[PDB]
Amino acid sequence: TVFRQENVDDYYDTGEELGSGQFAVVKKCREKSTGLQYAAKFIKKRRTKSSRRGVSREDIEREVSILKEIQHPNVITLHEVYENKTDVILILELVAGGELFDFLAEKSLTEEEATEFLKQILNGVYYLHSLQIAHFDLKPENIMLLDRNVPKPRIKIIDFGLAHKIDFGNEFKNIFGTPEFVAPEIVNYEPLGLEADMWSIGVITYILLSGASPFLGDTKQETLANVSAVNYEFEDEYFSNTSALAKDFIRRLLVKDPKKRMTIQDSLQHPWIKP
Numbered sequence: 001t002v003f004r005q006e007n008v009d010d011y012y013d014t015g016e017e018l019g020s021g022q023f024a025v026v027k028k029c030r031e032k033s034t035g036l037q038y039a040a041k042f043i044k045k046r047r048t049k050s051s052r053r054g055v056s057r058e059d060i061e062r063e064v065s066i067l068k069e070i071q072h073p074n075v076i077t078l079h080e081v082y083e084n085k086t087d088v089i090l091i092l093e094l095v096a097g098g099e100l101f102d103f104l105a106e107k108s109l110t111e112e113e114a115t116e117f118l119k120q121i122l123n124g125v126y127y128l129h130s131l132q133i134a135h136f137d138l139k140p141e142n143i144m145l146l147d148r149n150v151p152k153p154r155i156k157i158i159d160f161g162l163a164h165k166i167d168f169g170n171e172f173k174n175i176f177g178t179p180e181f182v183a184p185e186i187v188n189y190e191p192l193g194l195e196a197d198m199w200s201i202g203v204i205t206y207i208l209l210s211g212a213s214p215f216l217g218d219t220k221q222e223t224l225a226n227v228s229a230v231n232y233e234f235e236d237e238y239f240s241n242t243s244a245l246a247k248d249f250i251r252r253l254l255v256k257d258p259k260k261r262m263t264i265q266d267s268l269q270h271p272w273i274k275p
């Protein structure tokens with residue numbers, strides 16, 4: 001599939017930088033014809049077949065195809081796609097309140113503040129999983145707030161660079177995100193399904209409540225070793241005044257066997273979550 005090959009600067013003015021990754025930069029922009037504002041992601045294309053600098057077109061097309069499916073308040077939307085010889089440029093929905101990650105660093109949350117975020121994340125993931133879409137890169141850096149200066153911030157899930165459709169209950173591709181948040185099946189190179197995101201959600205919830213990362217070791221390999229061995233515990237110093245029901249929620253997500261792990265529908269019916 002090809003995209004719009006006009007010069008993006010003919011239609012948009014860029015401004016402040018919003019995000020920056022391995023082969024991509026995200027820039028605030030304004031569409032000339034409407035005055036409406038967006039976030040433009042410039043993804044570097046592969047220049048040769050066997051290269052490792054830039055993103056394969058197969059991966060770019062998978063990501064664009066998944067993004068075009070999305071219309072939900074808790075998930076980022078895609079407006080347009082441009083390309084040239086060097087880049088594919090995604091015109092994405094603008095979210096101006098920064099990462100949940102940096103929001104958390106400004107402060108630990110109460111359980112209520114924790115669940116106001118979590119409920120939105122869960123609703124977003126419920127939408128995604130209903131479309132059989134596995135995100136595979138859920139973490140606080142990939143959760144963006146619309147406005148961080150409100151009591152109950154609204155969030156959107158971003159970064160579908162590792163996302164895959166799961167038409168057969170499981171996928172077996174080259175998939176590997178951030179060690180602190182990846183499920184054991186990812187660490188062990190097993191077939192992956194929607195269950196992996198649920199594990200990530202348990203890690204996120206642990207972090208929201210405690211301000212601590214449950215599997216983090218002194219190095220990437222140690223973290224992965226801890227993940228596979230399910231080497232985590234609720235430290236009394238962090239959780240002594242956290243409800244046992246919140247611990248139950250997390251404990252039912254941080255399960256090694258994906259088949260025994262809570263599904264997104266289960267997580268929504270959990271007493272800690274359910275009204």
Ligand SMILES: O=c1c(O)c(-c2ccc(O)cc2O)oc2cc(O)cc(O)c12
Binds near residue numbers: 063161
């Ligand atoms: O950092 C962003 C981002 O990675 C992404 C992003 C979204 C989808 C995707 O598939 C890949 C991305 O990097 O979107 C953003 C949108 C914004 O309004 C602001 C942002 O900082 C980002």
